Amino acid sequence: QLKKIHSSVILLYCSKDEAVLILSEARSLGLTGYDFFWIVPSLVSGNTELIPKE
Amino acid sequence: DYDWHVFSLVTTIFPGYRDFISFIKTTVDNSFVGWDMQNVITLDTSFEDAKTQVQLKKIHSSVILLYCSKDEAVLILSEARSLGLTGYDFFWIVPSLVSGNTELIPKE
Structure with a gap:
């Protein structure tokens, strides 16, 4: 897949x-x-102090 | 002879690949x-x-010519x-190096 x-552009939802x-x-x-741009909603970019290194 | 005039060329670092590529270019x-x-x-890396992707x-x-x-x-x-x-659609052409002993035919 x-x-x-x-x-x-690759929209993500998880x-x-x-x-x-x-x-x-x-x-x-x-x-x-x-060249690849990722856009995520406010679910995945939650608290702006916990930023995983991935 | 079959009118396949658009092709590519995939070669690994097996010995002789430079001779192969130079001859094809000159021809x-x-x-x-x-x-x-x-x-x-x-493809020089370890896949x-x-x-490689x-x-x-x-x-x-x-049409793809392969040499490995x-x-x-x-x-x-x-x-x-x-x-x-x-x-x-895609057609693969390989030399006698890869299609060796005809009794052993892998699954891929």
């Missing part, structure tokens, strides 16, 4: 814990270059 | 048919999926099948 994406894992997988599949 | 440069050799790809996404043609040992050919073909590069 994930290997089909070669677009630029909780913070699952978002961490999905972003790790996307980095492992070469989905986080200079 | 293409001195022909009447007008070959459109889109890419020249060398880390950070670079992007490299294999670059390919969009229908029979052990690396299995891995590359499995990766291409997962990416969606194997179907009714």
